[PDB]
Symmetry: C3
Subunit: 217 residues, 3 copies
């Protein structure tokens, strides 16, 4: 029905498989630290899976009036990211044994990032949408700042940090030019971009982490 | 007005009394571990109380169109379970000194279980409701799996585990045959079943736990 | 447009500045304990800032029918308080090294306090609104009870405790006489009162705490 459906179906499938793979891979792990990383990393795509399914079936989709039109907004993404983005930061923070003050800063900022993103997404005054985008972006930049200025461990963290910064930074650009923002890129193509980003930031990120010896004490 | 009102009133009352009883019972406890179990166990029915009240007054009730009808759906249950089910798992996990990786797995899975349950409850495409029910059930079965394959302590945990598995497993069956699912059992009877299950899984479970010497260090 | 706009604008500004001040002030802190207090205390007004902005732009405002009228209800306050009030309790609890059982009690009770407040705010049956207000108030009184009956540290905690009790206690009175309750005080004046309370309980509270040597190990 909706041209973006194929990407949602493929997104659902790839999150589903990634979840199952990490579930299997994690069986037999007894190391307490390793358990933590498997739990976090498996839960990410499991949640993403349910929200991709939500969007595919049309449950995670609403219409937001602005700019003199009914704009199709997939709210289910913010429900996803609200839980998955903090968990991904938690993998990075636990990897470097970050202290609780820094964890709370990252989680807090993340919560704000997604929350303002959501408000932006559903705002009916076109111009205001972008005020929310700017605040959320500030919060993202704060997160990237902490990650950078807040041997196997070092090495794996550096790789996952670089992966994070490049992928996460693309989301505000996609949002801004997409159907939630300027509407210069059509929803179908926006949906494809977000699937590639999400699968890379969840399953891609997850394969790198769970194959490393850093997760083990 | 609504025939199920009596069960909601009785549910409200019994959660209310259970909360007060556990509040009193917990006064004077100085043991740090015991405090944790009293806090968790008292908070469960306190939350359940407010949501039963919500449903009784009609605040926690919405109409969901599907199958060519306006179906009365008490959404307030998912608001309740979203917080109470994780807390009940937290009692069990703390009882056996489970590690944080296992706690996060259980909490995560629980969140998914209830979240998908909620989406199912509010889904307007009849057939899709059951896709959500199946996912949520998978998550429940994962939880039951971890509880089983993930002396006073051992003994009390075994009793509370068995209580949990039997009561929790009935919820998907009640949902499936109830007004949220197949609609072969009328809402009034469905409401009665859920009250008996909820009071047994919260106050019943809570009496067993708070009377045990396992809670003490 | 709305006469209360000036207070929302001023509220937004003052939370914004407080956030920036605490962000700057916190740079260079290396002490793990101090980090925790800076993270918590900076995040409070940051969240408050976004919700004040929400209300100013009109996003955090809905109309609730009751008493034969369309009543303008700023729901964005409960979204704010839901996260900021627990964080403020967390500052106090960490200050006195409270145990996890007490933290969970305070957080739990807080969650209930705000949650019932929200339900009250949006309830369409006028008389029921006040049942919810009474429950939420009970939860508040429980919180105040725990704070009181549950040298620099002692001294700073006593000052912040006294600040908390006096400011927090005014909220139910403002709600009750305001546009959410009895409607004897007009929304503009209610909005002013809440701004003064919020800025005092967040920035005021935050200046006292972050200037103390108690935050340091
Ligand atoms: C699995 C999903 C991931 C890792 C998603 C990350 C999402 C972001 C970093 C989104 C950022 C946004 C902004 C900074 C501006 C406002 C719009 C958002 C929410 C797309
Ligand atoms: C106090 C409440 C308790 C212990 C409730 C537990 C609820 C469940 C285990 C519900 C499970 C469900 C499924 C597995 C399938 C989908 C429908 C649900 C949410 C009823
Ligand atoms: C930054 C905000 C703060 C510290 C707000 C605290 C809010 C309260 C203590 C609100 C309490 C309420 C009641 C006890 C009764 C019901 C209405 C409420 C939610 C206003």
């Amino acid at each position: 029905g909706r041209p973006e459906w194929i990407w949602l179906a493929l997104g659902t499938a790839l999150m589903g498989l990634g979840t199952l793979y990490f579930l299997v891979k994690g069986m037999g792990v007894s190391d307490p630290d390793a358990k933590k990383f498997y739990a976090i990393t498996t839960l990410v795509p499991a949640i993403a899976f349910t929200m991709y399914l939500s969007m595919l079936l049309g449950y995670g989709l609403t219409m937001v009036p602005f700019g003199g039109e009914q704009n199709p907004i997939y709210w289910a993404r913010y429900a996803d990211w609200l839980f998955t983005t903090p968990l991904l930061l938690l993998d990075l923070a636990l990897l470097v044994d970050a202290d609780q003050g820094t964890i709370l800063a990252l989680v807090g900022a993340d919560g704000i990032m997604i929350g303002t993103g959501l408000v932006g997404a559903l705002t009916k005054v076109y111009s205001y949408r972008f005020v929310w985008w700017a605040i959320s972006t500030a919060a993202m930049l704060y997160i990237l700042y902490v990650l950078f200025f807040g041997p196997e461990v070092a090495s794996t963290f550096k790789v996952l940090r670089n992966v994070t910064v490049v992928l996460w930074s693309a989301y505000p650009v996609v949002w801004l030019i997409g159907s939630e923002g300027a509407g210069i890129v059509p929803l179908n193509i926006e949906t494809l971009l977000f699937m590639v980003l999400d699968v890379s930031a969840k399953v891609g990120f997850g394969l790198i982490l769970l194959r490393s010896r850093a997760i083990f004490g």
